[PDB]
């Protein structure tokens, strides 16, 4: 189990 | 008119090299990411990965990662797809997509490309 | 994270209501940001995938009234009210919580007149 999303907002 | 529009199909033999496009306009190049897309025979959809064209950060499926490469050109507005040594097994189509950059903004693909079937045999 | 959709095929008549569902084997709701990072997808024969929802419940532009998106945490469901002959296609749920952003297996709606 993973809490943490993988961010991809480079903006 | 947001559009990506990728290469026609290709044809290859086992062992070749080859480099797909997908030329993405009608909209701002560093707002978005571009992510690949293999189309699976009869049903199904596995993303290979993404690429960001001002960072160079590539994301790989840890199946196909090392086995393909992702790059992009900034200049062209295009996004690629390369094949280092092609096996039989690599054929099928393939598509493009946008993913939206922007602070606090959905990963989805809201604009695809038409698709390429790249063909592997002797 | 991988997705099961259910069921794989499904034949549905003209005007009735359609339901795909979509399961998670982890999940894909974040508690801060109260968002569920999943979509949906259409993909028609000679064509692209169009993309149906994201955020699971909200409506991309263009998109039919008729569909809808809902459910949370690991259970997703896919609504196609009052069903038209042009809604013939392969159906894919896909998250993007995490890397890789996997699709589903796929749902093949069959239209029956």
């Known amino acids: 189990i993973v809490y943490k999303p993988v961010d991809l907002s480079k903006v | 008119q947001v559009q990506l529009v990728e290469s026609g199909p290709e044809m290859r033999k086992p062992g070749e090299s080859l480099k797909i496009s997908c030329k993405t306009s009608?909209?701002?190049?560093?707002?978005?990411?571009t992510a690949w897309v293999r189309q699976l025979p009869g049903k199904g959809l596995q993303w290979m990965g993404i690429?960001?064209?001002?960072?160079?950060?590539?994301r790989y499926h840890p199946s196909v990662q090392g086995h393909v490469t992702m790059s992009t050109d900034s200049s062209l507005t295009t996004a690629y797809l390369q094949w280092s040594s092609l096996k039989a097994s690599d054929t099928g189509i393939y598509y493009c997509?946008?993913?939206?950059?922007?602070?606090?903004?959905?990963?989805?693909?809201?604009?695809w490309g038409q698709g390429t079937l790249v063909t592997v045999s002797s | 994270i991988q997705l099961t959709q259910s069921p794989d095929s499904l034949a549905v008549s003209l005007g009735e209501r359609a339901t795909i569902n979509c399961k998670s084997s982890?999940?894909?709701?974040?508690?801060?940001?109260?968002?569920?990072?999943l979509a949906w997808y259409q993909h028609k024969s000679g064509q692209p995938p169009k993309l149906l929802f994201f955020?699971?419940?909200s409506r991309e532009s263009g998109v039919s009234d008729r569909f809808s998106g809902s459910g949370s945490g690991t259970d997703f469901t896919l609504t196609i009210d009052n069903l038209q002959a042009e809604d013939v296609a392969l159906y894919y749920c896909?998250?993007?919580?995490?890397?890789?952003?996997?699709f589903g297996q796929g749902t093949k709606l069959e239209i029956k007149r």
């Open positions: 997509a946008r993913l939206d950059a922007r602070v606090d903004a959905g990963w989805q693909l809201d604009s």
């Open positions: 009608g909209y701002i190049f560093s707002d978005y990411w």
């Open positions: 690429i960001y064209s001002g960072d160079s950060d590539t």
């Open positions: 982890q999940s894909v709701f974040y508690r801060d940001n109260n968002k569920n990072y």
């Open positions: 955020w699971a419940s």
């Open positions: 896909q998250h993007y919580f995490n890397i890789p952003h996997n």
